[PDB]
Amino acid sequence: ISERFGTQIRGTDVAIRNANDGISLAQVAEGSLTEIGNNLQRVRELSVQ
Amino acid sequence: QVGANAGQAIAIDKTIDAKAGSLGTSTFATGATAALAASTDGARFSGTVMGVDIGTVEVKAGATTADASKAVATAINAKIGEAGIYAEANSDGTLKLS
Amino acid sequence: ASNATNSASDRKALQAEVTQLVSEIDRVAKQSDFNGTKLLDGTFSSQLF
Amino acid sequence: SVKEGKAVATADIALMRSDYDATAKTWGTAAAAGAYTAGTNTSANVQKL
Amino acid sequence: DVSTVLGAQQALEVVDKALGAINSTRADLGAIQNRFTSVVANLQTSSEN
């Protein structure tokens, strides 16, 4: 039982690490999409004229 | 992988395809013609476009195809806020609607 | 989303997050155990200590 | 009905449609407009949100 | 194209569609981020116990 508990704890740590990496990936993608949107807004304001 | 055992994982399906060659695809209906070539004496034109009346117009006795084309184009363009159709005149006497 | 000033797009945007949360609830409920004995899925019979 | 587990029967709705006309009229009353039907109930849980 | 009137009148519509798509994707990514945060918190508590 002690070995099984040890395996569970050691797995849990690296699981936390993997989840954090996923968070970072999402952050980067959203950061780029923001600038895409800003440029589109400028083009539309230009084209109304 | 978010678990300590085989088979415990979640997935991300897809984000977006944001290349400028495949963003905001759309279609517009176009290709209108009239084939109008009336001449000689003047006339009054009536009728409805897309369920909206456009009033009446009048041309002089010495009318020509170019004379009537521009009058009808003006009458159509007067109500772009409701019909949503843009009309362009043509030299021969036809019209193009987009 | 029960107000009257919203539109279809906003309701879809809210429904997306509702769906993600429901899936998370289901996964947590189905993947919980103590020493290989599943607890919260309705198979916990009488146990004697 | 937006209230859980509430029973509405045929007698719970009583619409006295009246005043059929108004030309030397509008005096008189009736019910009309049907009474009710027996549509089946709809069940719900967390998954079907 | 903007050098004529029709170019502008159709640029308005194409830009509207692009903005709609961008906003929907941003909403999806935000939902994913929230789910990952919840997962991390649950993992921490379980490991400690």
Side-chain angles (χ1 to χ4, degrees):
Chain A
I1 298 144
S2 51
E3 325 273 314
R4 287 208 262 281
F5 286 157
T7 57
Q8 294 309 122
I9 301 153
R10 295 164 92 129
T12 316
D13 203 343
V14 296
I16 298 184
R17 189 163 310 120
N18 305 350
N20 276 312
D21 303 359
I23 293 186
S24 302
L25 195 140
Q27 264 197 347
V28 171
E30 195 180 356
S32 292
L33 278 178
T34 285
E35 286 296 311
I36 288 284
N38 264 332
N39 269 325
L40 264 174
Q41 281 251 12
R42 176 58 163 137
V43 155
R44 184 201 203 276
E45 178 190 332
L46 199 45
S47 36
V48 153
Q49 207 195 325
Chain B
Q1 177 89 24
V2 288
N5 289 330
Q8 305 185 359
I10 80 181
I12 305 191
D13 293 339
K14 50 66 201 167
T15 73
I16 177 86
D17 174 44
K19 287 192 295 184
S22 66
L23 215 52
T25 314
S26 298
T27 53
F28 301 93
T30 302
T33 55
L36 172 58
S39 65
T40 309
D41 205 337
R44 317 189 206 252
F45 298 79
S46 314
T48 76
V49 165
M50 271 205 88
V52 166
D53 207 318
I54 63 158
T56 48
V57 295
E58 154 75 12
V59 291
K60 298 282 105 177
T64 324
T65 66
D67 309 339
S69 318
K70 53 204 304 293
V72 176
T74 302
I76 285 183
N77 266 4
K79 300 193 181 297
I80 195 181
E82 310 174 67
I85 281 176
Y86 185 80
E88 288 147 78
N90 204 351
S91 185
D92 58 346
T94 70
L95 297 156
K96 164 183 270 271
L97 324 169
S98 303
Chain C
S2 81
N3 216 0
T5 69
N6 290 2
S7 158
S9 60
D10 313 333
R11 306 231 170 86
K12 285 190 183 298
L14 300 155
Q15 177 69 78
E17 192 170 0
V18 163
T19 302
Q20 287 284 334
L21 287 168
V22 161
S23 310
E24 175 66 28
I25 279 169
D26 203 341
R27 179 200 80 97
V28 152
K30 264 200 281 193
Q31 299 203 339
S32 176
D33 77 326
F34 177 86
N35 196 12
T37 306
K38 304 286 182 67
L39 310 168
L40 318 176
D41 51 39
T43 65
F44 195 76
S45 68
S46 184
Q47 308 290 320
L48 274 76
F49 294 84
Chain D
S1 166
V2 299
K3 282 282 189 46
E4 177 262 355
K6 194 56 183 175
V8 46
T10 316
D12 274 312
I13 294 92
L15 273 194
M16 287 335 91
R17 149 72 172 272
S18 312
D19 314 338
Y20 287 166
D21 206 22
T23 60
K25 278 178 180 66
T26 282
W27 27 70
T29 184
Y36 196 39
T37 88
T40 178
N41 51 72
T42 70
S43 181
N45 48 3
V46 161
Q47 184 168 248
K48 296 185 291 311
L49 267 192
Chain E
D1 204 308
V2 170
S3 63
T4 42
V5 279
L6 287 90
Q9 307 264 32
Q10 308 169 336
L12 294 180
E13 303 273 0
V14 310
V15 172
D16 286 20
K17 300 206 61 168
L19 279 168
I22 295 292
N23 297 343
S24 72
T25 310
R26 265 140 71 85
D28 290 351
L29 292 159
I32 273 185
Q33 217 166 330
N34 268 355
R35 177 178 188 183
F36 263 116
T37 299
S38 169
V39 161
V40 168
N42 172 229
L43 267 175
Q44 209 157 4
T45 282
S46 165
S47 162
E48 190 263 304
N49 263 314

